[PDB]
Write a protein that binds this ligand. Structure first.
Ligand SMILES: CN1c2c(nc(N)[nH]c2=O)NC[C@@H]1CNc1ccc(C(=O)N[C@@H](CCC(=O)O)C(=O)O)cc1
Ligand code: MET
Ligand SMILES: [Zn+2]
Length: 750
């Protein structure tokens, strides 16, 4: 009979219990031991959930108070000195490294192309790798905890190659190649596996996801070295686990490994099956990832089963395992918590708890068990979705056909646009602006709330918001910034604010996923053809513009970001989703401009995140369609309308930037500048860091603009890295005057 397997379970709790206890711990409200007690409770409950569902292979060590990579960093001693001389207990060294100390946290990084973030493994020349008993041995201890409940588990750890390859050298050891520490770390993994074996762990899931990445040959040889060194009689069997993409270009690196088996992701790349199956040795098992670990759609049991059967056919039923494609970390906990969803819609979904039942049902179906009831219920749910008008919008379909060159091209090229814009706005050289969001007051939320419970009227809350915009615009004026923003006080998440106002979307009350730390998101879901029925942002920008003579930036989140930070449709391409969004946002841009908001900025903070993980056709089509969707949203406007675009990734492919043809591009950027020397359009290389205090001076700033001018001055805007939502009013006062005053100097040197 075919076994079922789960690669990881989200640990936040059905009621966000993990957030509340960890936050209460950090803020003094809860003891360390009450923190450990909620932990056990969460693990117990999640193990029990999986046992009761009937999952055969059940993970342990997937739990974490913060980040699983960090947990491994704590466990192997990759713990820089600075964190060590504050007498912090190791759990508190944990929290120091992740979320800093009144010392900066270690770097947060995007975990592949998910919207989960991990803590960078950081390594020095001095780093000595060892297990530490007295800190407890997390994977061993949690494996023992589950065994005592009568639940045998499979520890999950990130393998050595991936762990090293994703870490970076610390400041003090700049010249180090992390890959090179491989001899130094294998012994420690060995010893950990020895101790997991002693405890009674028979199998271990060893994550090597960097196999789905373009790897240098020199890095590929390291799998044979690493795994030759780990496998043995004194250790558990190893299931080398990959997810999120296609391992075929690295197939040679793993075709003669002494591991007991492999896992691959056949949701994201079903087509790799045949090749990866072909290299299985006698005895090695194949874990077939066929229940999506990253999206929330009810699995098609017939198609998933046919994927598993294709593997059975190549390899034999006793050597295949039905699996989630990745850890379920990236999905919400429990659909049954959703109180507001239409039952028709809810019938399309499965969250992490429902996905447990899916891998069990799928395993049974391919085992030969009659599960024809479930298959029929499932087939009925799938058939209903693919017919619903909630997904069939004939107007949007027709509008898609109208997409062409003209529709993604401005009426004139930038040099001609600049003339009409200099006349219309007559901005001074070194124009000063900001990215959109400012610090926010307590009256805000209470006012939002009162209007939500019906306490104040729409024509009470609308005035509370305009006063807050008025406060924000008045401040900028006296400060003397040239192009202004409204502060975004009417706004929640920069995506949900748009999703709620767009057809084709649904929202959850409890669909929470961990983004980083104790900090969670509740992404919108795209269920169908998207359109914009009416004005989303116009009223607030029209009000801010009516109160001042200065040009007011309207403010949009771009189509790629709305797509990437939502759960997408899996029955249509990302691309098609992005272009529907481009067209809906086009209507918004047009209404904005129509209302006299003729400066408009578009934020695409998720452009890099959606980048296909391998270079190739998929990567360059993405850049073409990512750019194309942006241009479809912004190209209907007059030559005197000024289009801005903001980015948070500093290493953003210059050519993608040029491909947008924004009048102005603002980019986080505290050489490369030269790529734009002969590109006409204007650019504000973000001159300073939005994520900390320390208000820089005239010459802090000043040195910058000369150092950047070492790029022509006719094209330079002065602005920070991002919005200031994450800061306070005092530190914002000076920064911005110091910023402006700095600009005024150059400006008044011509
Ligand atoms: C700008 N970022 C961002 C994103 N993804 C989304 N969807 N939204 C974002 O703002 N990815 C990159 C980064 C992630 N950072 C964050 C930062 C804060 C919160 C946050 O404010 N979380 C709150 C609840 C949010 C709410 O109530 O709407 C929390 O306390 O968990 C989420 C993600
Ligand atoms: C995260 S991108 C910038 C978004 C928005 N304009 C802000 O200033 O907050
Ligand atoms: Zn930004």
């Amino acid at each position: 009979m075919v076994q079922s397997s789960v690669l990881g379970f989200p640990r936040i709790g059905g009621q966000r219990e993990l957030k509340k206890i960890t936050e209460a711990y950090w803020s003094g409200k809860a003891t360390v031991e009450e923190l450990l007690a909620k932990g056990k409770e969460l693990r117990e409950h999640n193990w029990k959930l999986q046992q009761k569902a009937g999952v055969d292979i059940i993970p342990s060590n997937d739990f974490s108070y913060y980040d699983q990579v960090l947990d491994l960093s704590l466990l192997f001693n990759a713990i820089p000195e600075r964190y060590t001389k504050f007498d912090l207990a190791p759990i508190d060294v944990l929290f120091a490294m992740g979320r800093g100390l009144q010392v900066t946290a270690l770097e947060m990084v995007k975990w592949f192309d998910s919207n989960y973030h991990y803590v960078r493994p950081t390594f020095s020349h001095s780093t000595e790798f060892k297990l530490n008993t007295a800190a407890g041995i997390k994977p061993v201890d949690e494996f023992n905890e589950a065994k005592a409940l009568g639940v045998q588990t499979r520890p999950v750890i990130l393998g050595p190659v991936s762990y090293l390859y994703l870490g970076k050298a610390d400041k003090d050891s700049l010249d180090l190649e992390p890959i090179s520490l491989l001899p130094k770390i294998l012994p420690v993994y060995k010893e950990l596996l020895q101790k997991l074996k002693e405890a009674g762990a028979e199998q271990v899931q060893i994550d090597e996801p960097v196999l789905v990445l373009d790897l240098p040959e020199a890095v590929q040889s390291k799998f044979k070295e690493a795994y030759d060194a780990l496998v043995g009689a004194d250790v558990p069997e190893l299931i080398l686990t990959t997810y999120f993409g296609d391992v075929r270009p690295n197939l040679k690196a793993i075709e003669n490994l002494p591991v007991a088996g492999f896992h691959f992701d056949f949701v994201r790349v079903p087509e790799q099956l045949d090749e990866v199956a072909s290299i299985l040795k006698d005895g090695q098992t194949l874990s077939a990832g066929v229940v999506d670990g990253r999206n929330i759609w009810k699995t098609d049991f017939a198609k998933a089963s046919a994927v598993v059967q294709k593997a059975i056919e190549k390899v034999g039923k006793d050597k295949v395992v039905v699996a989630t494609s990745s850890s379920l970390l990236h999905t919400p906990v429990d659909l049954e918590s959703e109180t507001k969803l239409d039952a028709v819609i809810k019938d399309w979904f499965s969250f992490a708890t429902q996905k447990l039942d899916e891998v069990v049902v799928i395993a049974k179906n391919v085992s030969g068990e009659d599960v024809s009831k479930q298959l029929e219920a499932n087939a009925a749910s799938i058939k209903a979705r693919s017919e619903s008008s909630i997904t069939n919008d004939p107007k949007v379909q027709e509008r898609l056909t109208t997409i062409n060159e003209a529709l993604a091209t401005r009426k004139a090229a930038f040099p001609e646009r600049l003339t009409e814009q200099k006349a219309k706005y007559n901005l001074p050289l070194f124009p000063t602006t900001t990215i959109g969001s400012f610090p926010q007051t307590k009256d805000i939320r209470i006012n939002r709330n009162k209007f939500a419970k019906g306490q104040i009227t729409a024509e009470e809350y609308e005035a509370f918001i305009n006063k807050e915009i008025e406060t924000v615009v008045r401040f900028q004026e006296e400060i003397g910034l040239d192009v202004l923003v409204h502060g975004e006080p009417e706004r929640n998440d920069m995506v949900q604010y748009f999703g709620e106002q767009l057809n084709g979307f649904a929202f959850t009350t409890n669909g929470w996923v961990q983004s980083y730390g104790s900090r969670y998101v509740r992404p919108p879901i795209i269920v169908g053809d998207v359109s914009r029925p009416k004005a989303m942002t116009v009223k607030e920008s029209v009000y801010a513009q009516s109160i001042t003579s200065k040009p007011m930036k309207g403010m949009l989140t771009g189509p790629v970001t709305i797509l990437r930070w939502s759960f997408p449709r899996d029955d249509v391409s990302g691309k098609i989703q992005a272009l529907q969004l481009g067209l809906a946002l086009r209507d918004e841009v047009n209404d904005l401009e129509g209302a006299g908001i003729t400066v408009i900025q578009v934020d695409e903070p998720a452009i890099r995140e959606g980048l296909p993980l391998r270079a190739g056709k998929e990567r360059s089509d993405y850049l073409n369609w990512a750019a194309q969707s942006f241009r479809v949203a912004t190209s209907g406007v007059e030559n005197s309308t000024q289009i801005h675009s903001h980015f948070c990734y500093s290493d953003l492919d210059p050519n993608h930037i040029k491909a947008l043809d924004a009048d102005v591009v603002s980019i986080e950027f505290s050489n490369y500048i030269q790529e734009f020397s002969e590109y006409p359009n204007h650019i504000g290389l973000g001159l300073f860091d939005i994520h900390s205090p320390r208000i820089p001076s005239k010459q802090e700033f000043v040195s910058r603009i000369e150092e950047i001018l070492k790029y022509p001055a006719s094209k330079f805007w002065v602005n920070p890295d991002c919005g200031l939502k994450t800061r306070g009013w005092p530190e914002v006062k000076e920064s911005l005057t110091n910023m402006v005053e700095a600009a005024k100097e150059f400006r008044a040197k011509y």
